Paper text:
The discovery of the catalyst responsible for the reaction between carbon dioxide and bicarbonate came with the isolation of carbonic anhydrase (CA, EC4.2.1.1.) from bovine blood in 1932. This enzyme is essential for accelerating the conversion of carbon dioxide to bicarbonate ions and protons, increasing the rate up to a million-fold. The cone-shaped active site has a depth of about 15 Å, with the catalytic zinc located at the base and coordinated by three histidine residues. The enzyme core comprises a ten-stranded β sheet surrounded by seven right-handed α helices. Humans have 15 α-CA isozymes that regulate pH and fluid balance, and they are involved in various physiological and pathological processes.
In this article, we performed correlation analysis between several new crystal structures and the thermodynamics of binding of two groups of compounds, fluorinated (VD series) and chlorinated (EA series) benzenesulfonamides. Here, we describe CA II and CA IX recognition details of two structurally highly similar sulfonamide compounds, EA3-3 and EA5-3. Crystallization of CA IX is rather challenging and thus we used a mimic of CA IX, called chimeric CA IX (chCA IX). The chimeric protein is a multiple mutant of CA II, where six amino acids in the active site of CA II are replaced by the amino acids present in CA IX at the same positions. We have previously demonstrated that such chimeric protein mimics actual CA IX to a rather good approximation. CA IX is the CA isozyme that has direct relevance to cancer – its expression is induced in hypoxia under the control of HIF-1. In tumors, CA IX helps cancer cells survive under hypoxic conditions, while in healthy tissues, its expression is limited to the gastrointestinal tract. The main class of CA inhibitors is the compounds bearing the primary sulfonamide functional group. Such compounds bind to CA isozymes by making a coordination bond between the negatively charged sulfonamide amino group nitrogen and the Zn2+ ion. The sulfonamide amino group made the coordination bond with the Zn2+ ion in all cases. Therefore, despite the relatively similar recognition mode via the coordination bond, the compound’s exact chemical structure significantly influenced the affinity.
Author numbering: 3 to 260
The structure:
Amino acid sequence: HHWGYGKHNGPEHWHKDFPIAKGERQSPVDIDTHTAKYDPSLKPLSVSYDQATSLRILNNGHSFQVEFDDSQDKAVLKGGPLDGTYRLLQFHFHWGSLDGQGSEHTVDKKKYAAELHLVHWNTKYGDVGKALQQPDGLAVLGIFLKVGSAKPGLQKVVDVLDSIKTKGKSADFTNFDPRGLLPESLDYWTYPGSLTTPPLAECVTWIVLKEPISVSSEQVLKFRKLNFNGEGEPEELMVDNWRPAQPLKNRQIKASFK
Ligand SMILES: CCCCNC(=O)c1cc(S(N)(=O)=O)c(Cl)cc1SC1CCCCC1
Ligand SMILES: [Zn+2]
């Protein structure tokens, strides 16, 4: 009876195995755009992904993830609200069964069809397992997806999903450029938060871009064809793999823009 996203094992149940689920800096949150404070001392985000080395794509049973070589500074996030250098580990998505849901963060209670998370770890901690134990260990760049025109840079990901349909399947996935998933603007909101999946560790500086990317209805349909189950098990479509907004508590969301 491991955690997941169903009625019997979904977000309302996670606190029993992961008590931090009810902690003081949980994610995601609703971004109330009128309450976020413009902070003129926030720096522009520096996304340096020119030397990114993608390695593999994996269906982990909760999402799918594209993994990168993070054994040297090849794909790094710096600047913005961060101190020092964060290496890209992997990206993955959360999505819904319908286009009016699927994002984890919300903006003035608006849900997007999906959310992309680019997960990075602070190099000062040496490895991601150590970074998970630190309040400034991770930084996640979150990007909303709306349905409209296709995102050309997402198509190589979509096209290989059939080969990783079920839990535990992986494929080689080299030469993928994550720059092709970014919107034009790097304007963002930021707040201190957590993983949105177990173990829900409170180690994340969230950087959520204000501009969504557009994907097509056919791209998100391919996400919804993936399975939570492993091969040869009863089919359970991987949809609605999102945690809903958690209490902001004693936190301020800061905007990089006016
Ligand atoms: C048990 C893993 C289930 C799937 N979760 C993730 O892949 C994941 C999601 C987020 S999120 N939705 O906040 O961006 C983040 Cl920040 C880190 C990780 S992978 C991380 C898990 C703990 C061990 C180190 C890698
Ligand atoms: Zn995520």
